[PDB]
Write an enzyme that holds these catalytic residues in place. Sequence first.
Site, short mmCIF file in Angstrom:
data_model
loop_
_atom_site.label_atom_id
_atom_site.label_comp_id
_atom_site.label_asym_id
_atom_site.label_seq_id
_atom_site.Cartn_x
_atom_site.Cartn_y
_atom_site.Cartn_z
N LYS A 1 0.82 -1.21 0.00
CA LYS A 1 0.00 0.00 0.00
C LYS A 1 0.85 1.26 0.00
O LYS A 1 0.50 2.25 -0.64
CB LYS A 1 -0.94 0.00 1.21
CG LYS A 1 -1.96 1.12 1.26
CD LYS A 1 -2.65 1.13 2.62
CE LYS A 1 -3.62 2.30 2.75
NZ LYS A 1 -4.33 2.26 4.06
N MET B 1 -22.83 -34.56 -8.10
CA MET B 1 -21.69 -35.39 -8.44
C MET B 1 -21.55 -36.55 -7.47
O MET B 1 -21.57 -37.72 -7.86
CB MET B 1 -20.41 -34.57 -8.49
CG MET B 1 -19.16 -35.42 -8.57
SD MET B 1 -19.18 -36.59 -9.95
CE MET B 1 -18.73 -35.53 -11.31
C1 FAD Z 1 -15.10 -34.45 -11.41
C2 FAD Z 1 -14.31 -34.38 -12.75
C3 FAD Z 1 -14.27 -35.48 -13.60
C4 FAD Z 1 -13.55 -35.39 -14.81
N1 FAD Z 1 -13.52 -36.45 -15.64
C5 FAD Z 1 -12.82 -36.36 -16.79
C6 FAD Z 1 -12.79 -37.58 -17.74
O1 FAD Z 1 -13.37 -38.58 -17.46
N2 FAD Z 1 -12.05 -37.50 -18.96
C7 FAD Z 1 -11.35 -36.28 -19.33
O2 FAD Z 1 -10.74 -36.21 -20.35
N3 FAD Z 1 -11.40 -35.12 -18.41
C8 FAD Z 1 -12.16 -35.20 -17.13
N4 FAD Z 1 -12.20 -34.15 -16.30
C9 FAD Z 1 -11.49 -32.91 -16.63
C10 FAD Z 1 -9.97 -33.03 -16.32
O3 FAD Z 1 -9.78 -32.99 -14.93
C11 FAD Z 1 -9.23 -31.84 -16.97
O4 FAD Z 1 -9.92 -31.49 -18.13
C12 FAD Z 1 -7.80 -32.21 -17.42
O5 FAD Z 1 -7.15 -32.84 -16.34
C13 FAD Z 1 -7.05 -30.93 -17.78
O6 FAD Z 1 -7.34 -30.69 -19.13
P1 FAD Z 1 -6.13 -31.04 -20.17
O7 FAD Z 1 -5.12 -31.91 -19.47
O8 FAD Z 1 -6.62 -31.75 -21.39
O9 FAD Z 1 -5.44 -29.64 -20.61
P2 FAD Z 1 -4.85 -28.60 -19.48
O10 FAD Z 1 -4.23 -29.37 -18.34
O11 FAD Z 1 -5.94 -27.68 -18.99
O12 FAD Z 1 -3.65 -27.79 -20.26
C14 FAD Z 1 -3.13 -28.60 -21.27
C15 FAD Z 1 -1.89 -29.34 -20.71
O13 FAD Z 1 -0.81 -29.47 -21.90
C16 FAD Z 1 -0.12 -28.36 -21.87
N5 FAD Z 1 -0.42 -26.96 -22.31
C17 FAD Z 1 -0.96 -25.95 -21.63
N6 FAD Z 1 -1.05 -24.87 -22.39
C18 FAD Z 1 -0.56 -25.19 -23.60
C19 FAD Z 1 -0.37 -24.50 -24.80
N7 FAD Z 1 -0.77 -23.11 -24.90
N8 FAD Z 1 0.17 -25.11 -25.83
C20 FAD Z 1 0.54 -26.38 -25.73
N9 FAD Z 1 0.38 -27.08 -24.62
C21 FAD Z 1 -0.15 -26.50 -23.54
C22 FAD Z 1 -0.08 -28.00 -20.34
O14 FAD Z 1 1.00 -28.66 -19.75
C23 FAD Z 1 -1.35 -28.59 -19.74
O15 FAD Z 1 -1.03 -29.39 -18.63
C24 FAD Z 1 -12.88 -34.23 -15.14
C25 FAD Z 1 -12.93 -33.13 -14.27
C26 FAD Z 1 -13.64 -33.21 -13.09
C27 FAD Z 1 -13.65 -31.99 -12.16
C1 TPP Z 2 -16.63 -26.34 -2.64
C2 TPP Z 2 -16.65 -27.70 -3.30
N1 TPP Z 2 -17.17 -28.72 -2.66
C3 TPP Z 2 -17.20 -29.91 -3.20
C4 TPP Z 2 -16.67 -30.10 -4.46
C5 TPP Z 2 -16.73 -31.47 -5.11
N2 TPP Z 2 -17.96 -31.38 -5.85
C6 TPP Z 2 -18.03 -30.86 -7.14
S1 TPP Z 2 -19.55 -30.87 -7.66
C7 TPP Z 2 -20.25 -31.50 -6.39
C8 TPP Z 2 -21.74 -31.76 -6.32
C9 TPP Z 2 -22.41 -31.16 -7.54
O1 TPP Z 2 -23.33 -30.19 -7.14
P1 TPP Z 2 -23.51 -28.91 -8.16
O2 TPP Z 2 -22.17 -28.30 -8.39
O3 TPP Z 2 -24.42 -27.87 -7.57
O4 TPP Z 2 -24.09 -29.44 -9.60
P2 TPP Z 2 -25.16 -30.67 -9.78
O5 TPP Z 2 -24.42 -31.88 -10.28
O6 TPP Z 2 -25.79 -30.98 -8.46
O7 TPP Z 2 -26.23 -30.25 -10.76
C10 TPP Z 2 -19.30 -31.76 -5.39
C11 TPP Z 2 -19.66 -32.36 -4.04
C12 TPP Z 2 -16.14 -28.99 -5.08
N3 TPP Z 2 -15.58 -29.10 -6.41
N4 TPP Z 2 -16.15 -27.82 -4.50
#
Ligand code: FAD
Ligand code: TPP
Lengths: 582, 169, 155, 169, 155
Positions: free
Chosen positions: A171, A485
Site C-alpha cells: 500500500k 456429483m
Molecule cells: C469431477 C471431474 C471429472 C472429470 N472427468 C474427466 C474424464 O473422465 N475425462 C477427461 O478427459 N477429463 C475429465 N475431467 C477434466 C480433467 O480434470 C481436466 O480437463 C484435465 O485434467 C485438464 O485438461 P487437459 O489436461 O486436457 O489440458 P490442461 O491441463 O488444462 O492444459 C493442457 C496441458 O498441456 C499443456 N499446455 C498448456 N497450455 C498449452 C499451450 N498453450 N500449448 C501447448 N500445450 C499446452 C499443459 O502442460 C497442460 O497441462 C474431469 C474433471 C472433473 C472436475
Molecule cells: C466447494 C466444493 N465442494 C465440493 C466439491 C466437489 N464437488 C463438485 S460438484 C459437487 C456436487 C455437484 O453439485 P452442483 O455443483 O451444484 O451441480 P449438480 O451436479 O448438483 O447439478 C461436489 C460435491 C467442489 N468441487 N467444491
Amino acid sequence: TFISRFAPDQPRKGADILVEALERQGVETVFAYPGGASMEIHQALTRSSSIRNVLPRHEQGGVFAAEGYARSSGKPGICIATSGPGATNLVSGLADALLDSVPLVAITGQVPRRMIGTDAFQETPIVEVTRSITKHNYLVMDVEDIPRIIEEAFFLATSGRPGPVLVDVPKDIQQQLAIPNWEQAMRLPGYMSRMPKPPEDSHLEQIVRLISESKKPVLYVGGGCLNSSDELGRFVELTGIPVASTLMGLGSYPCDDELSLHMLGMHGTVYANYAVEHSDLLLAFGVRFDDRVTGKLEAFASRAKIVHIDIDSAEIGKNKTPHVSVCGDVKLALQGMNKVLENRAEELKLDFGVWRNELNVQKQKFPLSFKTFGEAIPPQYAIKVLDELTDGKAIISTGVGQHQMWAAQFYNYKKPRQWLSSGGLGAMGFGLPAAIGASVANPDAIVVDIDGDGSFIMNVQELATIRVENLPVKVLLLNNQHLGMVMQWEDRFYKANRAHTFLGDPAQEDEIFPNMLLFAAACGIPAARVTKKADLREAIQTMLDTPGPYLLDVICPHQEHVLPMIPSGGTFNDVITEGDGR
Amino acid sequence: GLLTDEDTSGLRSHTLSLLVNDIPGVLNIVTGVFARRGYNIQSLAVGHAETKGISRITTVIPATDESVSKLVQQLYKLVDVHEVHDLTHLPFSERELMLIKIAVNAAARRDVLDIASIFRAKAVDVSDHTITLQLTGDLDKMVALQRLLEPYGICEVARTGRVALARES
Amino acid sequence: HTISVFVGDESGMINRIAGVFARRGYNIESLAVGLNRDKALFTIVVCGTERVLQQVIEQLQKLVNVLKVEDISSEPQVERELMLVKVNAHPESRAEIMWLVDTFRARVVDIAEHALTIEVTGDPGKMIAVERNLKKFQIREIVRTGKIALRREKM
Amino acid sequence: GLLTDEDTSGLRSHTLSLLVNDIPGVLNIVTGVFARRGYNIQSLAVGHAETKGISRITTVIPATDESVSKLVQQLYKLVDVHEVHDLTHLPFSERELMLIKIAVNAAARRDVLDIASIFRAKAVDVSDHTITLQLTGDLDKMVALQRLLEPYGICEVARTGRVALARES
Amino acid sequence: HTISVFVGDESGMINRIAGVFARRGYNIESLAVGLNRDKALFTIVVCGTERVLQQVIEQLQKLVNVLKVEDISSEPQVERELMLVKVNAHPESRAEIMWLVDTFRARVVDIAEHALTIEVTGDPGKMIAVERNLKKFQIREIVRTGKIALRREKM
Ligand SMILES: Cc1cc2nc3c(=O)[nH]c(=O)nc-3n(C[C@H](O)[C@H](O)[C@H](O)COP(=O)(O)OP(=O)(O)OC[C@H]3O[C@@H](n4cnc5c(N)ncnc54)[C@H](O)[C@@H]3O)c2cc1C
Ligand SMILES: Cc1ncc(C[n+]2csc(CCOP(=O)(O)OP(=O)(O)O)c2C)c(N)n1
Ligand SMILES: [Mg+2]
C-alpha cells in the site's frame, strides 16, 4: 505506440504506474473488489477509461470472472483484490488457473511495506500463501520496477503453461511517488532457459515416422489446443485421426464433424474411451493426463505408444510415461506440423477407415442415452436441446460436477474458448462468475451459462454484478436439490444411501429450494423455472432474445446418474453399464 | 535430547544441485516444491553461487530417478530456478562439514582428538567442559565419527548437509 | 543476527522455517541444516536489527515443530562455512592456486586438467576472502554451505 | 587363524618386473611359468602399466640369478611378455601398501595410532571394534609394523605385495 | 564385484586362483596378493554381474587350498591401491608435479634429473585421477598394485 494517460516524466502514485502498465500490455477489463488496502489502484482506475472495472460482488467471484475473461478471450485476465481477505478469496481462482492452465494475473494490494507480515491489519501474506498454487508471485518493493514485474507477469501469464501470477503491491508502494521507467527488460533469467523453442520437424519426424506405423491412432487433445482454432481441424484435415477432447479442449476440435468423440476418460463419452483404450499410438496434443481421465497410470492405453506435445516441459512424463515425447507450443508446432507435412501428403498413411470403422459400430452400441422417467427433464437432453436452439456457437460456462459433464458430453462445441470449465480445480461456484468475465471477453456474443443447484448458489452474489454491468448472461440452473456429483459417488463407490447429498430443505423437498426466481427477482434479473420438456424449448426461446441477462431453472431428476464412473485407478473393463440413482 | 541424529541418506537419496536467484524467499519457493511434490527433503544446504546475485541449493531427496524426473523438470516450473542438475547418477564430490561439540574430561580429550586426527578434523574449539570438532568430507566419514563419538559425551552436532559438485574426473 | 533452530518430527521442516522468514518479510542472509529422520539443526543468519531478530527468534517458536530456537549471535560462536569451489585448473594459473589453497588450508577433492575442486572451510571472514581472492582466477561454480555456529561453551 | 603372516622375503628373493599384455588370463600364463619352472612365488602384484592395454606384474621369486636367468628368458618364451627386468641386482623402489585391521579398545587405540604416526601410516578406517591402518613403504617397514602390532589385537592384514621400479638414482 | 580370498598351504597358490578365472572365462579387473610361507590374502575384482560373481565366489571354493572366499563388495570397504608412478622429472614440468603429488599426498621415493618416482596410495577413484591427471605429464612407467579391500568392521 502506447497512448500514455499522463506525462512520461511525471513522478506520481505507483498505482498510476501500475494501471498504465496494465493497458501497456493491452488489457481492457479488470475485476477489482474495492480497496481498503488496494485503494489507489481503484483510484488510479477511475482516471482511466481504456480499462474497465467490472467490480465483482465477491473476490472469488472476481477471480473466477478474471478466469472467465481469461479463458473466454485468451487475453490474460486481471483480477484486483483488496489485500488480505480479498486476496485469500483469490486462492480459489488462482488454484483454478494453475490446474486449469489459464493465463491469469492477480494484481492485489498489500499493507504498507513497513507492516508486511507483522500480524498486521487487513493482511494475509498472500505472496507466500499462494506460492504453491500460482505460476509466480511478486512482492515488489519499489515504484520504479512496478512495470518491470507487470510485463514480466504478462510474460509469465502468456509464456509456458499459462499460469496465474499473483502480483502484489504494498500500500505504501503506490503511496510512494516516483517516475515510471517503462521499457526495462524481463528480469526473468531462469525462465528464458526453458522458454520453449519451436520444435522443428526433425523432432516431429519420429511423430510422422510413426503416423504410418500407427494403425490405431487417437487424437487425445485438450487444453493445449486452447489456441488451436482450426489448426487441430487442419491437422485432422491432413491425416484424419479420431479425436479425444478433454474439458479445456472441448471446443478446440469443433465437436460436430465426422470424428465427433466429445469427451474421453472416466466420466467422458464411453465410445471415446473405446477410441482411446484401443489405440496403438496415443497421440496427445496438450493434455495433463490426470487421474480421472487415465484411471490407471500404466493401463490407460497400455497397448499404445504415447506421443505428447505440450508447451510445459514438466508436464511431459508427470502423470503418464510417454513412449516418445516432444515439447513445444502446440499451435505453433501444429503450424509446424500441418504446413510442413504437405510434402508427405502423398507419402503418409491416411489408412484409418478400418480404425474409423471401429468407432462407427461403437458410436451407437455405446450411446449417449438417458431415462425420461415420466416428464422430469433429462439435462443430457436439455443440452442437446441447447445446441438445437442456441444457433450454433455459444460461449458456455459451467460450475462443476454432474452438471459439468452434462455440458461436456451433450453440447456440440464449435470453437475453443467458447466453453468454460473447472476440471483441474473442479471449483464449485465457478460457473456464474465465469459467465461474468465471458460477458466482457465476448460481450455481444452469446454467453450462455449452466450451473448446478449448489454451484449456482455458491457464487450467487455475482448476479448483482450483472445488472450493474448489463451483461447478457444466459444462465441455466440444473437443479436437483442435491450434491449431484457425489450422490453417484455414493452408489458406484460403496452404498446407495443419501448421506448429506440432499442440498434442499427437508421440510419442502418436493418444492424448489432455494427459489431462484426470487433470486434473480431480488437482483431484478428476469428468470424462469422449468420441469417439463414442452416449456424447455420455450424457455430457451425466451432466453436468447432476453435483453441483458436471463436466468432459468430446469429441474434435474435428483436420482439420475451418468456413465461412466470408475474408482480411481481403473480401466474401461471397469466401466459402469447403466447406473442411475434409483 | 541434545544431539542431531546420525546420517542423512537412505537407498534412493538423489541429490539435486539447484541454481536459483538470490530472492529473499527463494528457499521457500524451492523447498515449497519438495513439499508440494510430497518429497521428504533428507538434507539441504543453500549458499551463494559463483555469480554474486544468484544462489545454489544442494538438496538430498529420497526419490528414484523416475520420480526425480518428475521433479527436476518440475523444479524448472519455478521461475527463479536457472538450472537443476541430477548429480546422483554422476561422480560427485560430497563434502559436508559437521561441527560436533563433545563434552569430555581431560584424559578423554586425549582419546578424542586422536580420532579427530584420524579424520583430519580440525578441533576448532576446546574447553574443559567440552571440545568441539569440525570435520569435513563425505557423509560416510561424517557418520563414522558420530558412530564413534556416541561413546563420548556428545553435544549439539551442528552439521551442514551434503554439498555437491559433479567432478569432471 | 544469527539463529540456531532445533526442530522435531515432521517432513518439510524447512518449509515451516523458510516460510516464516519470507512471509514475515525478514531476509535470511544464509541458512543450512542437518536434517534427519526426526531431528534437524538449522543455522540461520538473518540480516536484520536486534529488534526484528527478537521477533523471529520467537515468531519461529510460533511454529509447532520447533523444539528450540536460540539466538546464538551474542555468544562467542564458531562460524564455520564450507565452500566447495570448483576452479578452472589451467596450469598457467593453477600453479598459484596451489598455495592459495594451502593458505586457506583446504583439501582439493577432485582435479581435472581444467577443473579442480577445493574444500575451503571455516570463518566467513576467511570465506569472503576466497570468494574475492580466488575470484581473481576464473571460478567455474562456487557451491557453499551455510554458516554453521555453535557455542564456545564454558559453564 | 585370522592374520596374514609376517614377511614375503628370504635370502635369494629375486624380483622380476614383468610387462605383459592385458589378456584376461595373462596372470595365469605368467605364474603358469613360475609354477612350471618349479618356482615358489613369494610375492606378486599385478596392475596396468603406463600404456593402457598392457599390464605389469611385479613378482618375488626365491631363486638365485643363475636360476633367474633360466626364468627371465624363459618368461620371454611366453607370447604376451613384452619385457622382464631383473631389478634385484639394481637399486629399486620397493613400496608395498599393507592394510592392517587391528581390533583395539579406546585407550589402546591411542597406543596404536602413535605407532602408525611413526610409520606415516594413514589410519584409513577406525571403529570402536577396531582400527585399520594403511602403511606403505619398503617391506622392512611392513614387517616392523606387523612385528609391533602382534602385541595388539590384529585382524586381516590385507597386504599387497612388493611393487618395484628400478630407480635411476 | 570384488572378492577377497584367503588360501592355505601350497605353492603356486595363484595358479589355482588365476586359472579359475581364465578357465571359467570370467575376467579379473585387478588382483593383488600378499603371499607368505603358507598364507596369502588375494583381493580380486572381477568385472562381472552379481550372478556370475556368485558363481566364482563359490567356484573358487571348488579349489581345495582356499580357506575362505568372501565377496567384500557389499560391505563398506577400504579400497586402497598403490601406484608407484615413475614420471619424467624435467624441471620445466617437474615444477607442478610437486603440488600434483602433494594433492594426492604421496611420497616421492627416488628422484633423478629426468625421472622421479611417486607413491600414490588409496581410493581407485583417486588412482584413476593420477592415471589421467598425471598422464598430462609424460609418464615413464606406471606400476601399480591391485586394489586391496578390507571390512570397515562394526559389529
Ligand atoms: C469431477 C471431474 C471429472 C472429470 N472427468 C474427466 C474424464 O473422465 N475425462 C477427461 O478427459 N477429463 C475429465 N475431467 C477434466 C480433467 O480434470 C481436466 O480437463 C484435465 O485434467 C485438464 O485438461 P487437459 O489436461 O486436457 O489440458 P490442461 O491441463 O488444462 O492444459 C493442457 C496441458 O498441456 C499443456 N499446455 C498448456 N497450455 C498449452 C499451450 N498453450 N500449448 C501447448 N500445450 C499446452 C499443459 O502442460 C497442460 O497441462 C474431469 C474433471 C472433473 C472436475
Ligand atoms: C466447494 C466444493 N465442494 C465440493 C466439491 C466437489 N464437488 C463438485 S460438484 C459437487 C456436487 C455437484 O453439485 P452442483 O455443483 O451444484 O451441480 P449438480 O451436479 O448438483 O447439478 C461436489 C460435491 C467442489 N468441487 N467444491
Ligand atoms: Mg448442482
